[PDB]
């Protein structure tokens, strides 16, 4: 629900989620990077 929940998940965990493609994972990284955040903090 929150950005703080998303930032704790690893890239390998997000790829296990249902309806989660490589394209949507790249979108999430690019958007988090635009805000100075990274996956796995």
């Amino acid at each position: 629900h929150y950005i703080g929940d998303l930032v704790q998940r690893t890239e390998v965990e997000l790829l296990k989620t249902p309806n989660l493609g490589k394209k949507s994972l790249t979108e999430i990284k690019d958007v988090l990077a635009s805000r100075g955040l990274s996956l796995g903090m």
Binding site: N19, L20, K22
Partner: protein
């Protein structure tokens, strides 16, 4: 007091099939625990009850061990042997200790330990002791009626349960009513009801017949099968080895008196009694009673039987809501298709025409030769491909070269279907592509490829949402296959 102690211990043993020794060992452990609770410092206690007087001595037990971890409860073998040279590892050293006064506290501790073997375990013990009742028709008194189950009292602190599915659909029991039922399962719920009793299952019918028909109890007549629609209708199949005894007549009894006693106990359930035959077709004819069967066709490969009846008997053969055919099918173990003589002939003509069309299309034979193959009993391309060459050579007009050519054509017709299964579907070519994703058969690979997912890479690029409309693919199975595809494509 002295004799009263021993008499009480004997009464516990009698209450729920226990032992005087097992009751005393447990009272000793109970008293040791009660003395250890009173003792502020946690120290091992050993109580010994004299079996003649009921007097008891309490010790400070010292578990003789090799290495002492708990100096308050353990003593070394060397130190134990200094007091008594006869002691071994695992024995107890004692110490003169004041026995706990038997107040209502110790009384509550010891009587509960005795109740753990003569109230909760008494339920299980009584069920086991009644080895006949466990399996046959036990009799209980209704103690409590709930929405989902009935609790029965069997006596001796044994409680049984009838579940809602284990009752007949029209039975209404009240507290205090006597109920018979088969003990079909003994579990381990000593506290409560470990015994499960049924009135709905077929075993209730079998055991009622065993009690009502002496010839079944004497093993002169055997019940081979029983099929049951509880509180409505049942069928039983009976056999005898004695040619002097009619097994159906014995189970019916004088003017139906025996079968009517069983029916009355089952709330007016209609019972058909049929002769068991070792021929499946003759046994199914008997099972279809009271409907007259005109012909039977047996399909051994599908384990099915087509039953032709006269148009006037069709409604009787099916029965109310299919009850007669269903009970006959459950009794025989065969799937039973009931139709008219005219419908059976129309079905056989349609099957013969479909076989002729199949053979003409795939074997490149004329309709006359395809008709001869169907008249000789060949219905499938598999039969023609795999049947022994001798059976095909018994057909008038077939020579060894023509049989070999027919078999080669039949195998090639199947190889053309296997080529589609390999590529178009996914049994070889697309098995390492559209079906590479773990959890996808040849059918699923062709369903994926119909959506444009032709490769293992195409599947790795999908979302669960893109595959959600594929018939037979759950979101979990889609997610597993996409992850398997990604593991191979992106992490291999």
């Amino acid at each position: 007091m002295n004799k009263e102690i021993l008499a009480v211990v004997e009464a516990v043993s009698n209450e729920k099939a226990l032992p005087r020794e097992k009751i005393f060992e447990a009272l000793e452990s109970a008293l040791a625990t009660a003395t250890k609770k009173k003792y502020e410092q946690e120290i091992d206690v050993r109580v010994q009850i004299d079996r003649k007087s009921g007097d008891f001595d309490t010790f400070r037990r010292w578990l003789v061990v090799d290495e002492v971890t708990q100096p308050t409860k353990e003593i070394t073998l060397e130190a134990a042997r200094y007091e008594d040279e006869s002691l071994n590892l695992g024995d107890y050293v004692e110490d003169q200790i004041e026995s706990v006064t038997f107040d209502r506290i110790t009384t509550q501790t010891a009587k509960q330990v005795i109740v753990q073997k003569v109230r909760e375990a008494e339920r299980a013990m009584v069920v086991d002791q009644f080895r006949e009742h466990e399996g046959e028709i036990i009799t209980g008194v209704v103690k409590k009626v709930n929405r989902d189950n009935i609790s029965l009292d069997l006596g001796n602190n044994a409680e049984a349960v009838i579940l809602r599915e284990d009752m007949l659909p029209r039975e209404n029991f009240r507290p205090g009513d006597r109920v018979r039922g088969v003990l079909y399962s003994v579990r381990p719920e000593a506290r409560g009801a470990q015994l499960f009793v049924t009135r709905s299952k077929p075993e209730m019918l079998i055991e009622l017949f065993r009690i009502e028909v002496p010839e079944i109890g004497e093993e002169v007549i055997e019940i081979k099968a029983a099929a049951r629609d509880p509180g409505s209708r049942a069928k039983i199949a009976v056999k005898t080895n004695d040619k002097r005894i009619d097994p159906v007549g014995a189970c019916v009894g004088m003017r139906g008196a025996r079968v009517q006693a069983v029916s009355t106990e089952l709330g007016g359930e209609r019972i058909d009694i049929v002769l068991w035959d070792d021929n499946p077709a003759q046994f199914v004819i008997n099972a279809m009673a009271p409907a007259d069967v005109a012909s039977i066709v047996v399909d051994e490969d599908k384990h099915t039987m087509d039953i032709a009846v006269e148009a006037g008997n069709l409604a009787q053969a099916i029965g109310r809501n299919g009850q007669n055919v269903r009970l006959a099918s459950q009794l025989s173990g065969w799937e039973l298709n009931v139709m008219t003589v005219d419908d059976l002939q129309a079905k056989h003509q349609a099957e013969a025409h479909a076989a002729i069309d199949t053979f003409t299309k795939y074997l490149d034979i004329d309709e006359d030769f395809a008709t001869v193959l169907v008249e000789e009993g060949f219905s499938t391309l598999e039969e023609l491909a795999y049947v022994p060459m001798k059976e095909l050579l018994e057909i008038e007009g077939l020579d060894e070269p023509t049989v070999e050519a027919l078999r080669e054509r039949a195998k090639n017709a199947l190889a053309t279907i296997a080529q589609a299964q390999e590529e178009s579907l996914g049994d070889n070519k697309p098995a390492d592509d559209l079906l590479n994703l773990e959890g996808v058969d040849r059918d699923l690979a062709f369903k994926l490829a119909a959506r444009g997912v032709c490769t293992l890479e195409d599947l790795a690029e999908q979302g669960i949402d893109d595959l959600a409309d594929i018939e037979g693919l759950t979101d979990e199975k889609a997610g597993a296959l996409i992850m398997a595809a990604r593991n191979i494509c992106w992490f291999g």
